[PDB]
Amino acid sequence: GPSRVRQNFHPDSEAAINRQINLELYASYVYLSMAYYFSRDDVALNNFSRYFLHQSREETEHAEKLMRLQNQRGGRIRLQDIKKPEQDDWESGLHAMECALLLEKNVNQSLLELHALASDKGDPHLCDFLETYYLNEQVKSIKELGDHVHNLVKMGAPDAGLAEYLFDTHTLG
Amino acid sequence: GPSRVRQNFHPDSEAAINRQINLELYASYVYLSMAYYFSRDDVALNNFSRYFLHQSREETEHAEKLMRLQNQRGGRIRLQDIKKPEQDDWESGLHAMECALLLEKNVNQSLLELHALASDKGDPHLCDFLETYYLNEQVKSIKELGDHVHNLVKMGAPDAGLAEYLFDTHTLG
Amino acid sequence: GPSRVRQNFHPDSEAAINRQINLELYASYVYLSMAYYFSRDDVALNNFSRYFLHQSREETEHAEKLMRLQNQRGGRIRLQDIKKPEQDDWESGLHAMECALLLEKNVNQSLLELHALASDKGDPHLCDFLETYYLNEQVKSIKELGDHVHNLVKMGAPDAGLAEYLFDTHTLG
Amino acid sequence: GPSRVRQNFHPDSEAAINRQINLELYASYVYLSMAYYFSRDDVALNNFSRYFLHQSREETEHAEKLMRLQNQRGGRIRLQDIKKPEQDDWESGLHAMECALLLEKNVNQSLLELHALASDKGDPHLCDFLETYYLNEQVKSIKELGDHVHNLVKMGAPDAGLAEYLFDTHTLG
Amino acid sequence: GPSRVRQNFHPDSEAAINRQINLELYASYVYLSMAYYFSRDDVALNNFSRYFLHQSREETEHAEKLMRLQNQRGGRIRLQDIKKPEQDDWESGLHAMECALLLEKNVNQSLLELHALASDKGDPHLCDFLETYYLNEQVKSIKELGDHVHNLVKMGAPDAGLAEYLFDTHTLG
Amino acid sequence: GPSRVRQNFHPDSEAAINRQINLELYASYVYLSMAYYFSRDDVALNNFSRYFLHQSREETEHAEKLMRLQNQRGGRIRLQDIKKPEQDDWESGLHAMECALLLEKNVNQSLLELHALASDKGDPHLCDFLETYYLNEQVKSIKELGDHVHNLVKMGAPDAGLAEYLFDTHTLG
Ligand SMILES: [Cl-]
Ligand SMILES: [Cl-]
Ligand SMILES: [Cl-]
Ligand SMILES: [Cl-]
Ligand SMILES: [Cl-]
Ligand SMILES: [Cl-]
Ligand SMILES: [Cl-]
Ligand SMILES: [Cl-]
Ligand SMILES: [Cl-]
Ligand SMILES: [Cl-]
Ligand SMILES: [Cl-]
Ligand SMILES: [Cl-]
Ligand SMILES: [Cl-]
Ligand SMILES: [Cl-]
Ligand SMILES: [Cl-]
Ligand SMILES: [Cl-]
Ligand SMILES: [Cl-]
Ligand SMILES: [Cl-]
Ligand SMILES: [Cl-]
Ligand SMILES: [Cl-]
Ligand SMILES: [Fe+2]
Ligand SMILES: [Fe+2]
Ligand SMILES: [Fe+2]
Ligand SMILES: [Fe+2]
Ligand SMILES: [Fe+2]
Ligand SMILES: [Fe+2]
Ligand SMILES: [Fe+2]
Ligand SMILES: [Fe+2]
Ligand SMILES: [Fe+2]
Ligand SMILES: [Fe+2]
Ligand SMILES: [Fe+2]
Ligand SMILES: [Fe+2]
Ligand SMILES: [Fe+2]
Ligand SMILES: [Fe+2]
Ligand SMILES: [Fe+2]
Ligand SMILES: [Fe+2]
Ligand SMILES: [Fe+2]
Ligand SMILES: [Fe+2]
Ligand SMILES: [Fe+2]
Ligand SMILES: [Fe+2]
Ligand SMILES: [Fe+2]
Ligand SMILES: [Fe+2]
Ligand SMILES: [Fe+2]
Ligand SMILES: [Fe+2]
Ligand SMILES: [Fe+2]
Ligand SMILES: [Fe+2]
Ligand SMILES: [Fe+2]
Ligand SMILES: [Fe+2]
Ligand SMILES: [Fe+2]
Ligand SMILES: [Fe+2]
Ligand SMILES: [Fe+2]
Ligand SMILES: [Fe+2]
Ligand SMILES: [Fe+2]
Ligand SMILES: [Fe+2]
Ligand SMILES: [Fe+2]
Ligand SMILES: [Fe+2]
Ligand SMILES: [Fe+2]
Ligand SMILES: [Fe+2]
Ligand SMILES: [Fe+2]
Ligand SMILES: [Fe+2]
Ligand SMILES: [Fe+2]
Ligand SMILES: [Fe+2]
Ligand SMILES: [Fe+2]
Ligand SMILES: [Fe+2]
Ligand SMILES: [Fe+2]
Ligand SMILES: [Fe+2]
Ligand SMILES: [Fe+2]
Ligand SMILES: [Fe+2]
Ligand SMILES: [Mg+2]
Ligand SMILES: [Mg+2]
Ligand SMILES: [Mg+2]
Ligand SMILES: [Mg+2]
Ligand SMILES: [Mg+2]
Ligand SMILES: [Mg+2]
């Protein structure tokens, strides 16, 4: 139009927010796939399942907050296909946690690139939005996944017969 | 393996359930797109937004119930890309409701085809699952959308200046 | 039009639902007639009266659920005259119960014919509707009436002076 | 017999009460037809539907009170067929309200004729019954329907697109 | 007689229900045997014991519901001897769970055969009964047992000294 | 082994306890058969049904207490087939009560023989177990059944039309 609300909002920032929306929806789908891997009759780790389902729902919330930001700033949401995850068979609790840690680091890198663009375009509202709602949640998530990977490795996952079971019951319980 | 749980569960039924999972996830994404159309500063119908967001969340629940069914029966979930919706700009409250009614009829037709396959394969568990959790919810949804389309048309949407506003406030409020 | 909601709904099913609506309204009227027979000053069995009045109200509910189904599916309700019952004088508590059992078996046979038509027309929504809300309620009703007929016969109704009175007070109380 | 209870109760009064029972049951059926007209997917005025359904239930209560009166006085209920209503398609909220007002005036005229007969036969119990439970309820009903017709006409029903919708939401809500 | 209640109820269905009653009572007895195996002083897994005792009681409930169905439909219950289980010594928690999974699949196959007979005899009441109360409970039971077998196998049962103990305490606790 | 718990527990006592377990399970099955006789549509005495169902459940409890005793003492449970009852058609409320009294006297005689064996083998734990949990419950049961038989006989069961009905409603109510 531009939108009657738009102010100090660069087209490059608008496009980068649309890309980030797709990545958060993609993360949601990866964790959904993982959740239902853990409720297979030949995996049957119900607390891993609940853990990943909760992560999936959180990613959807992250996507929605960016969609709200796009509207608040007068940008226009442009959705793209949500790619299927890389695996349906996630192999083990340890492997899923390692894949989740890598996914979170990848999403972090995208958010840091977004913040660098917002800085370059002199958009302190957008910088503040990312800092307030994204950057510290991402650091907490990466640390939690790092902790879970460490314990599973030390316990002897995936081959040690008791390791994933005991982690499921105690840590994720 | 087959799965140690699998019984009376045809490979064609397993594949058709995977296709239905994708369609429900697709429906969820269509309604998500609609919800955030209605919170644009140049649309600003917050009750249309909440209505479609609620529908989006319901579709995700429908997808998840099929994913649980796949696991319960010993089938293997196979996810595919979730296609983007046909529009980002949904034009008006009336147009969105008409698109939603068509989407629900399309999803209904797929569920009826699934039930016909389950009957052909002598799978009464699967027939019962669809009847109990899907077929009547779909009929209720189609009827509700038909009612909403009728009122918006009679009120003079989309061109009558008060129609969508008054429908937003009273019916969807 | 067809209706914008109509899907997989055969004209023969629509007509058979209208016929079933009339039969349920007819059943309601038979039981209403019976209820007020039992509050005549020369019959004066108030618990038989309440029993049949409750049955009358249930039949109206059954009719209304079919009328709602017709609307939900996009069919058009077509009402017909409600025929008067076969008797105003129902002769005795035993005779009324026997007539009620025959009426329920007749209504059952109509519902089974309706379900057979719905199956033939590949309408699993309609099949499920009948199974969920009608077929098992009909079996329960027929069994209850069979039980009541048995006890009244064994007790010596209608000629044994205490039989209907004692049944009124204990069983129907 | 006569009935051991019968006193001061003329055969003409007994017959006129049976005719009035049929008319109240007929009124109940007219309003039932109207209620389900308003829940069609191409009408979808749920508060008109609830209004008429409530009226239908009230008419049944009026019929039942006359049936109780017949028994109390020692007369014998004689039921007749309940004729189908004149329309299944009631055209509009305004048209339904106009038909309902005419029906209520017709039922009123019958009740006044009944009261005139009771006076002629020197039956003050029957006169009092009609005055206490019927005549003033009928006047209130006619006035309410007159009010509703007036507002719908002034608002521009049935052609004004907002009129029936706004009346549904505010007045009948 | 036939029974005054009997309608649309084939003699073959009546006989097959009597056979299914015996099988459910047999299942109850198998699980009772298992429950008291786990409270032997040389087994002493009290949560396995409680798990199987609960399953035993559920099977009795399933038998009783079929006995009620036989009466409701006007069939006549014909009881047969309840065969003793195949073992008194159930060897291990893993072996018991594997035997229970096989028993549940066998009972499932019988129920599917019963549903196929009911379909062949055009008995939708009986089809609905099995679908509503049996088929989905059986699928849930088979899935739960599959999950338990998987975890016990992965944990190293029966030879791993901690596996059954830890499963007893955490999963079955 | 012997069991590490076994002490002062003779092999003959162990075998006699296994025989008594079978007899209690047999009693449970007799009463289950009776319970569902009384809910036939041509018997329809619901309080007789509830009375016998309660007795059936009590017998199962008696069986289970002996199974627990076998484990506590270090004996090994050995289950046998549960024979079907002598009748499916129990003829009348009086006949069922008479059969139940005979069954209870038979079970009593077996328990007295068991107590005599325990005395002979100098097993005061087993003697005390039978005295504390079995012998007085059996005497109470026999007395209650004797009372019920007496009243039904005096009232004129089974031929007097009101006798079983009135007993059902008052005594067993
Ligand atoms: Cl700008
Ligand atoms: Cl951790
Ligand atoms: Cl590490
Ligand atoms: Cl299979
Ligand atoms: Cl609407
Ligand atoms: Cl329209
Ligand atoms: Cl159609
Ligand atoms: Cl009864
Ligand atoms: Cl009989
Ligand atoms: Cl009495
Ligand atoms: Cl008179
Ligand atoms: Cl008004
Ligand atoms: Cl006017
Ligand atoms: Cl307004
Ligand atoms: Cl039959
Ligand atoms: Cl498990
Ligand atoms: Cl495995
Ligand atoms: Cl010893
Ligand atoms: Cl007694
Ligand atoms: Cl005696
Ligand atoms: Fe999280
Ligand atoms: Fe959150
Ligand atoms: Fe959250
Ligand atoms: Fe959270
Ligand atoms: Fe995220
Ligand atoms: Fe791809
Ligand atoms: Fe994340
Ligand atoms: Fe900063
Ligand atoms: Fe919905
Ligand atoms: Fe839901
Ligand atoms: Fe929901
Ligand atoms: Fe909901
Ligand atoms: Fe859906
Ligand atoms: Fe595309
Ligand atoms: Fe939907
Ligand atoms: Fe308003
Ligand atoms: Fe009823
Ligand atoms: Fe009801
Ligand atoms: Fe009701
Ligand atoms: Fe009821
Ligand atoms: Fe009915
Ligand atoms: Fe006629
Ligand atoms: Fe009925
Ligand atoms: Fe079916
Ligand atoms: Fe009494
Ligand atoms: Fe009224
Ligand atoms: Fe009233
Ligand atoms: Fe009322
Ligand atoms: Fe009222
Ligand atoms: Fe009236
Ligand atoms: Fe006519
Ligand atoms: Fe009226
Ligand atoms: Fe269970
Ligand atoms: Fe249960
Ligand atoms: Fe239970
Ligand atoms: Fe349970
Ligand atoms: Fe079972
Ligand atoms: Fe044998
Ligand atoms: Fe089972
Ligand atoms: Fe069903
Ligand atoms: Fe007892
Ligand atoms: Fe007890
Ligand atoms: Fe007890
Ligand atoms: Fe007890
Ligand atoms: Fe006993
Ligand atoms: Fe035998
Ligand atoms: Fe006993
Ligand atoms: Fe003692
Ligand atoms: Mg991307
Ligand atoms: Mg597809
Ligand atoms: Mg008819
Ligand atoms: Mg008339
Ligand atoms: Mg068998
Ligand atoms: Mg024996």
Side-chain angles (χ1 to χ4, degrees):
Chain A
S3 171
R4 72 174 53 82
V5 307
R6 191 192 189 108
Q7 182 171 32
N8 195 38
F9 189 55
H10 196 281
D12 295 356
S13 300
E14 178 179 0
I17 288 163
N18 282 325
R19 291 195 299 271
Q20 186 72 35
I21 289 162
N22 190 259
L23 185 57
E24 302 288 342
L25 293 168
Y26 171 74
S28 179
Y29 201 23
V30 173
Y31 282 125
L32 179 70
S33 175
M34 291 179 177
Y36 285 81
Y37 171 80
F38 287 101
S39 55
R40 284 172 46 156
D41 73 275
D42 64 352
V43 181
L45 296 169
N46 292 348
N47 292 318
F48 276 83
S49 180
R50 292 187 324 96
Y51 178 76
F52 290 125
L53 189 58
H54 178 67
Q55 308 310 312
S56 175
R57 293 157 176 182
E58 288 304 311
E59 299 303 340
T60 299
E61 297 180 336
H62 299 167
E64 284 167 5
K65 181 154 204 103
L66 284 159
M67 297 171 80
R68 189 175 171 95
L69 169 75
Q70 188 81 280
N71 280 339
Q72 286 204 172
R73 292 301 297 274
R76 292 287 167 258
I77 295 163
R78 296 269 158 59
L79 297 177
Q80 295 298 344
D81 296 350
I82 306 167
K83 283 291 186 291
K84 73 172 165 199
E86 286 298 298
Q87 313 188 212
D88 295 288
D89 177 347
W90 291 101
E91 303 168 41
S92 67
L94 172 62
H95 183 69
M97 288 287 179
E98 290 176 349
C99 288
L101 171 57
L102 175 60
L103 166 70
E104 291 291 333
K105 295 190 81 167
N106 282 338
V107 174
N108 203 32
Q109 178 59 32
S110 177
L111 287 166
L112 291 171
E113 288 171 5
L114 223 191
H115 187 279
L117 172 63
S119 304
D120 287 345
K121 304 303 203 190
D123 191 336
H125 176 264
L126 177 54
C127 286
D128 169 71
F129 169 96
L130 291 171
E131 289 165 44
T132 302
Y133 300 108
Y134 290 77
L135 298 187
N136 183 60
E137 297 72 357
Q138 210 72 14
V139 160
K140 291 168 200 325
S141 290
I142 289 163
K143 173 59 166 57
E144 175 178 284
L145 284 167
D147 290 355
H148 292 352
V149 171
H150 168 70
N151 276 284
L152 283 168
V153 168
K154 175 66 149 152
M155 292 166 75
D159 292 340
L162 300 179
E164 290 184 5
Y165 179 84
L166 286 171
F167 187 84
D168 176 276
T169 42
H170 297 91
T171 311
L172 297 181
Chain B
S3 171
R4 72 174 53 82
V5 307
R6 191 192 189 108
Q7 182 171 32
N8 195 38
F9 189 55
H10 196 281
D12 295 356
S13 300
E14 178 179 0
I17 288 163
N18 282 325
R19 291 195 299 271
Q20 186 72 35
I21 289 162
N22 190 259
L23 185 57
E24 302 288 342
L25 293 168
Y26 171 74
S28 179
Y29 201 23
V30 173
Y31 282 125
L32 179 70
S33 175
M34 291 179 177
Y36 285 81
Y37 171 80
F38 287 101
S39 55
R40 284 172 46 156
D41 73 275
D42 64 352
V43 181
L45 296 169
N46 292 348
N47 292 318
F48 276 83
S49 180
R50 292 187 324 96
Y51 178 76
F52 290 125
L53 189 58
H54 178 67
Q55 308 310 312
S56 175
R57 293 157 176 182
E58 288 304 311
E59 299 303 340
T60 299
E61 297 180 336
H62 299 167
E64 284 167 5
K65 181 154 204 103
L66 284 159
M67 297 171 80
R68 189 175 171 95
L69 169 75
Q70 188 81 280
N71 280 339
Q72 286 204 172
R73 292 301 297 274
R76 292 287 167 258
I77 295 163
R78 296 269 158 59
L79 297 177
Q80 295 298 344
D81 296 350
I82 306 167
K83 283 291 186 291
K84 73 172 165 199
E86 286 298 298
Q87 313 188 212
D88 295 288
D89 177 347
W90 291 101
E91 303 168 41
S92 67
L94 172 62
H95 183 69
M97 288 287 179
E98 290 176 349
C99 288
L101 171 57
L102 175 60
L103 166 70
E104 291 291 333
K105 295 190 81 167
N106 282 338
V107 174
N108 203 32
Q109 178 59 32
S110 177
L111 287 166
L112 291 171
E113 288 171 5
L114 223 191
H115 187 279
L117 172 63
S119 304
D120 287 345
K121 304 303 203 190
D123 191 336
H125 176 264
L126 177 54
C127 286
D128 169 71
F129 169 96
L130 291 171
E131 289 165 44
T132 302
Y133 300 108
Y134 290 77
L135 298 187
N136 183 60
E137 297 72 357
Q138 210 72 14
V139 160
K140 291 168 200 325
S141 290
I142 289 163
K143 173 59 166 57
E144 175 178 284
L145 284 167
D147 290 355
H148 292 352
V149 171
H150 168 70
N151 276 284
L152 283 168
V153 168
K154 175 66 149 152
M155 292 166 75
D159 292 340
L162 300 179
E164 290 184 5
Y165 179 84
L166 286 171
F167 187 84
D168 176 276
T169 42
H170 297 91
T171 311
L172 297 181
Chain C
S3 171
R4 72 174 53 82
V5 307
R6 191 192 189 108
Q7 182 171 32
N8 195 38
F9 189 55
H10 196 281
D12 295 356
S13 300
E14 178 179 0
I17 288 163
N18 282 325
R19 291 195 299 271
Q20 186 72 35
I21 289 162
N22 190 259
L23 185 57
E24 302 288 342
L25 293 168
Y26 171 74
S28 179
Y29 201 23
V30 173
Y31 282 125
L32 179 70
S33 175
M34 291 179 177
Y36 285 81
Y37 171 80
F38 287 101
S39 55
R40 284 172 46 156
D41 73 275
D42 64 352
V43 181
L45 296 169
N46 292 348
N47 292 318
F48 276 83
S49 180
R50 292 187 324 96
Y51 178 76
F52 290 125
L53 189 58
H54 178 67
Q55 308 310 312
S56 175
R57 293 157 176 182
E58 288 304 311
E59 299 303 340
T60 299
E61 297 180 336
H62 299 167
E64 284 167 5
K65 181 154 204 103
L66 284 159
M67 297 171 80
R68 189 175 171 95
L69 169 75
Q70 188 81 280
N71 280 339
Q72 286 204 172
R73 292 301 297 274
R76 292 287 167 258
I77 295 163
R78 296 269 158 59
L79 297 177
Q80 295 298 344
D81 296 350
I82 306 167
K83 283 291 186 291
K84 73 172 165 199
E86 286 298 298
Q87 313 188 212
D88 295 288
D89 177 347
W90 291 101
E91 303 168 41
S92 67
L94 172 62
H95 183 69
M97 288 287 179
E98 290 176 349
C99 288
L101 171 57
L102 175 60
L103 166 70
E104 291 291 333
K105 295 190 81 167
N106 282 338
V107 174
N108 203 32
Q109 178 59 32
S110 177
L111 287 166
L112 291 171
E113 288 171 5
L114 223 191
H115 187 279
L117 172 63
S119 304
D120 287 345
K121 304 303 203 190
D123 191 336
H125 176 264
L126 177 54
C127 286
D128 169 71
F129 169 96
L130 291 171
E131 289 165 44
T132 302
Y133 300 108
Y134 290 77
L135 298 187
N136 183 60
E137 297 72 357
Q138 210 72 14
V139 160
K140 291 168 200 325
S141 290
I142 289 163
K143 173 59 166 57
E144 175 178 284
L145 284 167
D147 290 355
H148 292 352
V149 171
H150 168 70
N151 276 284
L152 283 168
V153 168
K154 175 66 149 152
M155 292 166 75
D159 292 340
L162 300 179
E164 290 184 5
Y165 179 84
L166 286 171
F167 187 84
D168 176 276
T169 42
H170 297 91
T171 311
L172 297 181
Chain D
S3 171
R4 72 174 53 82
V5 307
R6 191 192 189 108
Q7 182 171 32
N8 195 38
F9 189 55
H10 196 281
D12 295 356
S13 300
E14 178 179 0
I17 288 163
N18 282 325
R19 291 195 299 271
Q20 186 72 35
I21 289 162
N22 190 259
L23 185 57
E24 302 288 342
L25 293 168
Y26 171 74
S28 179
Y29 201 23
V30 173
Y31 282 125
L32 179 70
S33 175
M34 291 179 177
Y36 285 81
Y37 171 80
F38 287 101
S39 55
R40 284 172 46 156
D41 73 275
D42 64 352
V43 181
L45 296 169
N46 292 348
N47 292 318
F48 276 83
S49 180
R50 292 187 324 96
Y51 178 76
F52 290 125
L53 189 58
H54 178 67
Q55 308 310 312
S56 175
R57 293 157 176 182
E58 288 304 311
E59 299 303 340
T60 299
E61 297 180 336
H62 299 167
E64 284 167 5
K65 181 154 204 103
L66 284 159
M67 297 171 80
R68 189 175 171 95
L69 169 75
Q70 188 81 280
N71 280 339
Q72 286 204 172
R73 292 301 297 274
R76 292 287 167 258
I77 295 163
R78 296 269 158 59
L79 297 177
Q80 295 298 344
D81 296 350
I82 306 167
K83 283 291 186 291
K84 73 172 165 199
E86 286 298 298
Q87 313 188 212
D88 295 288
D89 177 347
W90 291 101
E91 303 168 41
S92 67
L94 172 62
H95 183 69
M97 288 287 179
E98 290 176 349
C99 288
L101 171 57
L102 175 60
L103 166 70
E104 291 291 333
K105 295 190 81 167
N106 282 338
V107 174
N108 203 32
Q109 178 59 32
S110 177
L111 287 166
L112 291 171
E113 288 171 5
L114 223 191
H115 187 279
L117 172 63
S119 304
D120 287 345
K121 304 303 203 190
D123 191 336
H125 176 264
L126 177 54
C127 286
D128 169 71
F129 169 96
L130 291 171
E131 289 165 44
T132 302
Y133 300 108
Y134 290 77
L135 298 187
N136 183 60
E137 297 72 357
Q138 210 72 14
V139 160
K140 291 168 200 325
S141 290
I142 289 163
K143 173 59 166 57
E144 175 178 284
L145 284 167
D147 290 355
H148 292 352
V149 171
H150 168 70
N151 276 284
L152 283 168
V153 168
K154 175 66 149 152
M155 292 166 75
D159 292 340
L162 300 179
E164 290 184 5
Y165 179 84
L166 286 171
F167 187 84
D168 176 276
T169 42
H170 297 91
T171 311
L172 297 181
Chain E
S3 171
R4 72 174 53 82
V5 307
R6 191 192 189 108
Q7 182 171 32
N8 195 38
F9 189 55
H10 196 281
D12 295 356
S13 300
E14 178 179 0
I17 288 163
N18 282 325
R19 291 195 299 271
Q20 186 72 35
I21 289 162
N22 190 259
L23 185 57
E24 302 288 342
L25 293 168
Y26 171 74
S28 179
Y29 201 23
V30 173
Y31 282 125
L32 179 70
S33 175
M34 291 179 177
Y36 285 81
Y37 171 80
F38 287 101
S39 55
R40 284 172 46 156
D41 73 275
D42 64 352
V43 181
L45 296 169
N46 292 348
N47 292 318
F48 276 83
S49 180
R50 292 187 324 96
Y51 178 76
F52 290 125
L53 189 58
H54 178 67
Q55 308 310 312
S56 175
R57 293 157 176 182
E58 288 304 311
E59 299 303 340
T60 299
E61 297 180 336
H62 299 167
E64 284 167 5
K65 181 154 204 103
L66 284 159
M67 297 171 80
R68 189 175 171 95
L69 169 75
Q70 188 81 280
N71 280 339
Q72 286 204 172
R73 292 301 297 274
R76 292 287 167 258
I77 295 163
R78 296 269 158 59
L79 297 177
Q80 295 298 344
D81 296 350
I82 306 167
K83 283 291 186 291
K84 73 172 165 199
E86 286 298 298
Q87 313 188 212
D88 295 288
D89 177 347
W90 291 101
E91 303 168 41
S92 67
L94 172 62
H95 183 69
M97 288 287 179
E98 290 176 349
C99 288
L101 171 57
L102 175 60
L103 166 70
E104 291 291 333
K105 295 190 81 167
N106 282 338
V107 174
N108 203 32
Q109 178 59 32
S110 177
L111 287 166
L112 291 171
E113 288 171 5
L114 223 191
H115 187 279
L117 172 63
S119 304
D120 287 345
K121 304 303 203 190
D123 191 336
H125 176 264
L126 177 54
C127 286
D128 169 71
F129 169 96
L130 291 171
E131 289 165 44
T132 302
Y133 300 108
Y134 290 77
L135 298 187
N136 183 60
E137 297 72 357
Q138 210 72 14
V139 160
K140 291 168 200 325
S141 290
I142 289 163
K143 173 59 166 57
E144 175 178 284
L145 284 167
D147 290 355
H148 292 352
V149 171
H150 168 70
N151 276 284
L152 283 168
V153 168
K154 175 66 149 152
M155 292 166 75
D159 292 340
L162 300 179
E164 290 184 5
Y165 179 84
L166 286 171
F167 187 84
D168 176 276
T169 42
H170 297 91
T171 311
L172 297 181
Chain F
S3 171
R4 72 174 53 82
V5 307
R6 191 192 189 108
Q7 182 171 32
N8 195 38
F9 189 55
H10 196 281
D12 295 356
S13 300
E14 178 179 0
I17 288 163
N18 282 325
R19 291 195 299 271
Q20 186 72 35
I21 289 162
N22 190 259
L23 185 57
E24 302 288 342
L25 293 168
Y26 171 74
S28 179
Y29 201 23
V30 173
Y31 282 125
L32 179 70
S33 175
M34 291 179 177
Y36 285 81
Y37 171 80
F38 287 101
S39 55
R40 284 172 46 156
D41 73 275
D42 64 352
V43 181
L45 296 169
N46 292 348
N47 292 318
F48 276 83
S49 180
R50 292 187 324 96
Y51 178 76
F52 290 125
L53 189 58
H54 178 67
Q55 308 310 312
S56 175
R57 293 157 176 182
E58 288 304 311
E59 299 303 340
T60 299
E61 297 180 336
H62 299 167
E64 284 167 5
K65 181 154 204 103
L66 284 159
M67 297 171 80
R68 189 175 171 95
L69 169 75
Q70 188 81 280
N71 280 339
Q72 286 204 172
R73 292 301 297 274
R76 292 287 167 258
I77 295 163
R78 296 269 158 59
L79 297 177
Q80 295 298 344
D81 296 350
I82 306 167
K83 283 291 186 291
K84 73 172 165 199
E86 286 298 298
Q87 313 188 212
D88 295 288
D89 177 347
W90 291 101
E91 303 168 41
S92 67
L94 172 62
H95 183 69
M97 288 287 179
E98 290 176 349
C99 288
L101 171 57
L102 175 60
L103 166 70
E104 291 291 333
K105 295 190 81 167
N106 282 338
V107 174
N108 203 32
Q109 178 59 32
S110 177
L111 287 166
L112 291 171
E113 288 171 5
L114 223 191
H115 187 279
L117 172 63
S119 304
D120 287 345
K121 304 303 203 190
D123 191 336
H125 176 264
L126 177 54
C127 286
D128 169 71
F129 169 96
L130 291 171
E131 289 165 44
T132 302
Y133 300 108
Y134 290 77
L135 298 187
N136 183 60
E137 297 72 357
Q138 210 72 14
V139 160
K140 291 168 200 325
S141 290
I142 289 163
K143 173 59 166 57
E144 175 178 284
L145 284 167
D147 290 355
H148 292 352
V149 171
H150 168 70
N151 276 284
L152 283 168
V153 168
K154 175 66 149 152
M155 292 166 75
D159 292 340
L162 300 179
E164 290 184 5
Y165 179 84
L166 286 171
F167 187 84
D168 176 276
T169 42
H170 297 91
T171 311
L172 297 181

